[PDB]
Ligand binder design. Structure first.
Ligand SMILES: O=C(O)CNC(=O)C(=O)O
Ligand SMILES: [Mg+2]
Ligand code: NI
Ligand SMILES: [Zn+2]
Length: 331
């Protein structure tokens, strides 16, 4: 078995190997990359996402989210308070202000220490889940707005045609902005490209050990657990590496820098934070190996998780027994 310790692997494809996306994901899995739940892909030196980022300030963040924490430094939840619209230019200025900027630090490890120590005492503002793309239409390789769709994958594997579309999202972050512990909708893969700015630190639990994370989460967030049998779908809970180590939960960590891709694999729980002002683009995708994970994915039916139009068909086809109850939660 390849990568039996479930380490995060880093890949360096040649320009030739960067031509066929599906084939390269399949290659990575042949090397055991999926066991970690997360892989880094460094694009060939000849590749670029677009010519420059000079003209992005007029993008609108229609609903910036202030991430308010409750709990203790290592075990907290966050809620999102909606703020008034601002442009990326305005947001970047806010991120760089004395109230919100990255503090002096020695290295990534010192910054990670300061994150876990101090996150709960501040409320950073996140421009998340903005439909759109920063890839140039002429970028042919690993252009997240030109991937084959999940609906076409399901049709090719299962023979059923379904409604729905699949488009990318932009994330504008600042120091301390946080992504809570989650897997993707329907335990899909995700791919994330860090277009510009400061790094993003990731934490991930191997898919084979996801249930260990879920059990700890039920112990640490006991009222949440009673309210819903899949409350990590709400994307609100944070657990520090210290706490995970104290409870013997297997995980790994890695920092993504501008110009690098990360891939999350089906049922790979992940969480993390941004180091300073940045802009990432991400999209879900599927492969044939995903189908069985889709069939087994947990679902939130309490009504909190509220997701996209396209998830309907996935639940309807892959999880027909669940469909009625899940849709009651959606409506
Ligand atoms: O970048 C973020 O804030 C969150 N991204 C992801 O969870 C992802 O790409 O799967
Ligand atoms: Mg613009
Ligand atoms: Ni994710
Ligand atoms: Zn729920």
């Amino acid at each position: 078995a390849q990568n039996p310790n479930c380490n995060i692997m880093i890949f360096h494809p040649t320009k030739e190997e960067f031509n066929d996306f599906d084939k390269y994901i399949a290659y990575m899995e042949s090397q055991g990359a999926h066991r970690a739940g997360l892989a880094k892909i460094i694009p060939p030196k000849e590749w670029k996402a677009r010519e420059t980022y000079d003209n992005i300030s007029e993008i609108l963040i229609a609903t910036p989210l202030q991430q308010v924490a409750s709990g203790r430094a290592g075990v907290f939840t966050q809620y999102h308070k909606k703020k008034k619209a601002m442009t990326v230019g305005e947001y970047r200025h806010l991120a760089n202000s004395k109230k919100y900027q990255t503090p002096p630090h020695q290295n990534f490890e010192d910054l990670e220490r300061k994150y876990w120590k101090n996150r709960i005492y501040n409320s950073p503002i996140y421009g998340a889940d903005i439909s759109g793309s920063l890839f140039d239409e002429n970028t042919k390789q690993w252009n997240l707005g030109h991937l084959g769709t999940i609906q076409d994958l399901l049709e090719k594997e299962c023979g059923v045609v379904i409604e729905g579309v699949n488009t990318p999202y932009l994330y504008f972050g600042m120091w301390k902005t946080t992504f809570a512990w989650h897997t993707e909708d329907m335990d899909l893969y995700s791919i994330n490209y860090l277009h510009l700015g400061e790094p993003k630190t990731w934490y991930v639990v191997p898919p084979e050990h996801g249930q260990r994370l879920e059990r700890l989460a039920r112990e640490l967030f006991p009222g949440s657990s009673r309210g819903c049998g899949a409350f990590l779908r709400h994307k609100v809970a944070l657990i520090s590496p210290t706490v995970l180590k104290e409870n013997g939960i297997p995980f790994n960590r890695i920092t993504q820098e501008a110009g690098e891709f990360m891939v999350t694999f089906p049922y790979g729980y992940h969480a993390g934070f941004n180091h300073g002002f940045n802009c990432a683009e991400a999209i879900n995708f599927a492969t044939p190996r995903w189908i069985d994970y889709g069939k087994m994915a947990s679902q939130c039916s309490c009504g909190e998780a509220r997701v996209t139009f396209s998830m309907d068909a996935f639940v309807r086809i892959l999880q027909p027994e669940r469909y009625d109850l899940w849709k009651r939660g959606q409506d």
